[PDB]
Amino acid sequence: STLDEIMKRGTLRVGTDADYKPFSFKDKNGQYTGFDIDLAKALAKELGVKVEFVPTTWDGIIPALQTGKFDIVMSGMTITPERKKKVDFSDPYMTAGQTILVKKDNADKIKSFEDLNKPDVKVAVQLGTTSEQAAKEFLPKAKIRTFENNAEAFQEVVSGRADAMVTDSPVAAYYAKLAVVVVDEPFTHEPLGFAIRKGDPELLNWVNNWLKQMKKDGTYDKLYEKWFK
């Protein structure tokens, strides 16, 4: 079990794609910070070990996990059926819907998702995310442009090279304040979880127990309100 491996080695290795505010990012001193980071820290404490963060590109984050580059994904990861087939998820630690971001100027042209499903519309998303999937399914006439990082996608919409970007609601809000604008999607919210390799119920139970505990004893709420005020 990875649990044994973790405790022997003395360190918890957390796979994270660390340009994803407010879940995981660098502060002004290039230090790891965010909701997922604080949670990672809490879990490490529970485990009696130190934390090490393993920066990983989002698109390959599941393969990195499956090939043992780290023990656990804590990186704003939505639980999906397709992903459940590859890894195991903890109980939900959060919920996020899909939000559309546009230039304040172009806020007039865009009531909803449907308004983006035209052939002249370019929409930016992070590669390998639920936002990519949502756009590809629900905006098939549009031009979807993908990016390794959200920051570039943000940059594409500001520069005018894209008409919009789709991202998780809490990320969209965080990018808004940086004087661009949000338009909201009523269609679907989904739970986020932490991912681990299959065949490790000791670690899964431990994580779930730990999480359960933090929701019981106030520690989680303190942390939620800290990042989502």
Ligand X SMILES: NC(=[NH2+])NCCC[C@H](N)C(=O)O
DSSP state for residue 92 in the 8-state scheme = P
Q: In the complex, what is the shortest distance from the CB of residue 11 to ligand X, in angstroms, rounded to a whole number?
A: 21
Span 6-25, contacts to ligand X by CB under 6 A: 17, 20, 23
Q: Is 2 in the site for ligand X (CB under 6 A)?
A: no
54/158 Cα distance (integer angstroms): 30
**Contact status: 75 vs ligand X (CB under 6 A):** yes
In terms of Cβ atoms closer than 10 Å to its own Cβ (0-12, 13-18, 19+), residue 58 is buried
Q: Please give the DSSP secondary-structure letter assigned to residue 11.
A: E
Residue 96 C-beta: closest distance to ligand X, Å: 6
Is residue 78 part of the contact set for ligand X (CB under 6 A)? yes
56 binds ligand X (CB under 6 A): no
Q: On the CB side of 7, how many CA atoms lie within 13 Å of its CA?
A: 9
Task: By CB under 6 A, name the one of 15, 22, 34, 76 that touches ligand X.
Answer: 76
Minimum CB separation of residue 8 from ligand X in Å reads 28
Q: Which is nearer to ligand X, 58 or 175 (CB)?
A: 58
Sign for the pseudo-dihedral over CA of 41, 42, 45, 47:
negative
Choose between 20 and 93: whose C-beta lies nearer to ligand X: 20
Number of residues that bind ligand X (CB under 6 A): 13
Q: Could you say whether residue 58 binds ligand X (CB under 6 A)? A: yes
CA dist 184 → 26, 111, 169, 175 (Å): 27, 9, 8, 14
- At its nearest, how many Å lie between ligand X and the CB of residue 222? 23
| For residue 92, cis peptide bond before it (omega within 30 degrees of 0) | no
Of the candidate residues 44, 47, 77, 125, the single one contacting ligand X (CB under 6 A): 77
CB 122 within 8 Å of CB 142: yes
In angstroms, the CA 119 to CA 42 distance is 47
d(CA 27, CA 18): 10
User: Which x/- pattern over 102-141 shows residues binding ligand X (rule: CB under 6 A)?
Assistant: ------------------------x--xx-----------
The SS3 assignment for 188 reads strand
Our finding on whether 98 is near ligand X (CB under 6 A) is no
Residues that bind ligand X (CB under 6 A): 17, 20, 23, 58, 75-78, 96, 126, 129-130, 168
